[PDB]
Each structure stands twice: as C-alpha cells, then as structure tokens.
Enzyme design. Sequence first.
Site, PDB file in Angstrom:
ATOM      1  N   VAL A   1       0.830  -1.240  -0.085  1.00  0.00           N
ATOM      2  CA  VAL A   1      -0.247   0.288   0.004  1.00  0.00           C
ATOM      3  C   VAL A   1       0.923   1.227   0.000  1.00  0.00           C
ATOM      4  O   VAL A   1       0.702   2.286  -0.618  1.00  0.00           O
ATOM      5  CB  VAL A   1      -0.838   0.083   1.171  1.00  0.00           C
ATOM      6  CG1 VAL A   1      -1.949   1.331   1.240  1.00  0.00           C
ATOM      7  CG2 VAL A   1      -1.803  -1.296   1.204  1.00  0.00           C
ATOM      8  N   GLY A   2       2.004   1.121   0.544  1.00  0.00           N
ATOM      9  CA  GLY A   2       3.044   2.272   0.883  1.00  0.00           C
ATOM     10  C   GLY A   2       4.311   2.180   0.854  1.00  0.00           C
ATOM     11  O   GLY A   2       4.917   0.825   1.469  1.00  0.00           O
TER      12      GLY A   2
ATOM     13  N   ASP B   1       0.175   9.120  11.713  1.00  0.00           N
ATOM     14  CA  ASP B   1       1.274   9.517  10.821  1.00  0.00           C
ATOM     15  C   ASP B   1       1.939   8.433  10.086  1.00  0.00           C
ATOM     16  O   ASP B   1       2.785   7.596  10.756  1.00  0.00           O
ATOM     17  CB  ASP B   1       2.028  10.312  11.793  1.00  0.00           C
ATOM     18  CG  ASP B   1       3.236  11.096  11.169  1.00  0.00           C
ATOM     19  OD1 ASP B   1       3.386  10.904   9.966  1.00  0.00           O
ATOM     20  OD2 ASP B   1       3.783  12.033  11.851  1.00  0.00           O
TER      21      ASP B   1
ATOM     22  N   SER C   1       7.582   0.670   5.082  1.00  0.00           N
ATOM     23  CA  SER C   1       6.786   0.351   3.849  1.00  0.00           C
ATOM     24  C   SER C   1       5.492  -0.103   4.495  1.00  0.00           C
ATOM     25  O   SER C   1       5.695  -1.031   5.364  1.00  0.00           O
ATOM     26  CB  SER C   1       7.358  -0.580   2.998  1.00  0.00           C
ATOM     27  OG  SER C   1       8.213  -1.365   3.771  1.00  0.00           O
ATOM     28  N   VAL C   2       4.394  -0.316   4.111  1.00  0.00           N
ATOM     29  CA  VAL C   2       2.997  -0.667   4.446  1.00  0.00           C
ATOM     30  C   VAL C   2       2.304  -1.596   3.449  1.00  0.00           C
ATOM     31  O   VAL C   2       2.320  -1.273   2.368  1.00  0.00           O
ATOM     32  CB  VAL C   2       1.998   0.659   4.594  1.00  0.00           C
ATOM     33  CG1 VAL C   2       0.742   0.347   5.178  1.00  0.00           C
ATOM     34  CG2 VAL C   2       2.792   1.708   5.782  1.00  0.00           C
TER      35      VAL C   2
END
Length: 332
Positions: free
Chosen positions: A26-27, A161, A30-31
């Site tokens: 997703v991100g 955040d 890191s996500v």
Amino acid sequence: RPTFYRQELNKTIWEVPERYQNLSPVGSGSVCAAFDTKTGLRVAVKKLSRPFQSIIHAKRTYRELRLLKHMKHENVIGLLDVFTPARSLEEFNDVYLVTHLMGADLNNIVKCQKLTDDHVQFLIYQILRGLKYIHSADIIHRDLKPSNLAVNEDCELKILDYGATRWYRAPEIMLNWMHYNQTVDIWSVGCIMAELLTGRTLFPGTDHIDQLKLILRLVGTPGAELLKKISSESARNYIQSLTQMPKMNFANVFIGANPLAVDLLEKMLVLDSDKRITAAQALAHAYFAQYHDPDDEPVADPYDQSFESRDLLIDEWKSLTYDEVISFVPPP
Ligand SMILES: Cn1nc(C(C)(C)C)cc1NC(=O)Nc1ccc(Cl)cc1
Ligand SMILES: CCCCCCCCO[C@@H]1O[C@H](CO)[C@@H](O)[C@H](O)[C@H]1O
C-alpha cells in the site's frame, strides 16, 4: 511464538506471523494491507525501515512504539499488534506494527467527492476530538494533513502518521521558531477544513518561500502585538522586510460556506499561535452543535515522555524497544 513466513514485496523482505495473509503493498517504512485470520478483518502492517541504524533512528523507533501503545481513542490510530521475527534481543532488528485498515485516506476521498457542510462538520469534529486526546498527553502531531487521516465508509476518521507536506504546516514551524505550542495542529486543521469546504488546497505553495507568501496574503503580515513577542531582532526585521499584507476578511474568501464554519476558520488561522483556538475550545464551537458531547470527548492517561530528554546508546534504545514489544497487550 507464532510461525513466521517469509515473502518479497517490491524487493523488500517481509516475515510476519501466519495469522496475517494476502499481504499487498500500500505504501513506501513500507505498508501492506493484509487479512487477519484471527479476527477476519482487514489490517495494515507497517514494517519499520532500518529501525536501529543510528541513535536518532533508534530513539525514533522507541518513540513510535511507546506512542502507539499509549493511543487508545476512537479517532486516533490504535495498535492491534506489534511483532518481530527475532527470538532474542541479540537477533532483534525488525519491527512490524499492526492496525485496523480503514478503507482510504482523506486525500483520496476529497479527490472527487464534493463534501456537504454536514460532512465537513463531522470530519472536522472527529479530527478535533482525536486531537483533544492527543493534546491531553502533551503530544503534538506536527504533520497533520489529509494523507495522515484514515476514513471508513461511514466517513469515521482516525488520526495517524504514516511518516506537498508543507501545505498544511504552521508558519512558525517553517520559520523554526522552536517552542511550538500544540495549536500548530490547529493551524493544520484550519487548512484541512478550508479545503473540505472549497474543494481546493488553501495554501498550495510551490516551495518554502511561496508557502509563506500565500499564507501572509490571507492572514496578513504580523500585527503590532505579535511583533511585540519576537525575541530575535534578526527575525523581527526579516519579517518587517516582507511585503506588508492586510489581513483578508474570511467571509469574503469562503463566500458560500456556513457562517459558523467561517467563524471557526478565523479562530484557527490566526498567525499568533497564542491566539489560536485549542482543540477543546473548538469542540464547544457552535459549528459542531450536532456532534458535540462533552461527556464523550475523552482525554489520555498520563504519558511518561521523560525518555525524550535522554541521550542513550543504540543498544539501550534497542533494548527498551524490545521490552515494549514483549510487554504488549492487544486490545479486546
Ligand atoms: C508517529 N505517530 N504519531 C502519531 C499520532 C501523533 C497521531 C498519535 C501516530 C504515529 N504513528 C503512526 O501512526 N504509525 C503508523 C503505524 C502503522 C501504520 Cl499501518 C500507519 C501508521
Ligand atoms: C510570519 C511570522 C508568523 C509566525 C508567528 C509565530 C506566532 C506564534 O507565537 C509564538 O509561538 C510560539 C510557538 O511555540 C509560542 O511558544 C510563543 O510563546 C508565541 O509567542
């Protein structure tokens, strides 16, 4: 200890408990999104990037964990899980943080949907409600912006955040005042709300100096009583060099908005941080009459932030982080 499986997502290595499956990036820390097999809900897993590389990274890692473990509020990110693949403090080098997946962020919602006044009321109320809580622990967000707000399909909101950003930042930051009262977050709220009302970024500066000039065009160059507070003489006539801007009438700026919304914007977007409405005061503002409940706007337990004054070695910070992982108790 659960069984951990390894995977590769964008050249990055991910070892997580088997509990979490269908990991999809997703991100980029890191996500990933994932399916929690224990609860049957969708989660977000963030892998901390090189968490103990320097003393500063290491203190930041400890800071993040300590923070998330304290946050227990409906409008603020809550920790569901924290894990490492390590079995000892000696092997300990990765940190993973787990939270509930709210479907989208506020930027990706406003990118098409024109919000009604009721949407603005409810979305801003929730931001202020979570901020009342965050502020009560003596925490300042410092980087509030639509991309740091997770929203579900019921337009329920959580502040987090994930780690231009300048568009929502208080002018006293971009001029390293150093101090920062908690109403830096209130400035960011004003910027968000303005954008929810008009559908346009309020101060979309091209760079640092454009950002400030756009701001001063709205709110005006500092009044006498503000200049009266500026300790530094260098700063005082750097400010008194810039083009002398009159403060704009907000009613003439946000033309068709609810007059209560305009009034709230005026109390948030004041240059002098001492004159800015607080989160708790803003909750009692007539704009949120349909949402305000003084008995359901809770504050945080005392938050021990003394570690912030401490100067320790990487292994010390690392060790304290490990203790916090081990002692974690998941929510009900
Ligand atoms: C650093 N920090 N500060 C806060 C506030 C101020 C909102 C409590 C929250 C956080 N950290 C985070 O919100 N971190 C985080 C962890 C996992 C995911 Cl999937 C997304 C984000
Ligand atoms: C372009 C110049 C506008 C910036 C003016 C800053 C207004 C904030 O005012 C100052 O802010 C600090 C924040 O930590 C407070 O602690 C100070 O005591 C307060 O006087």
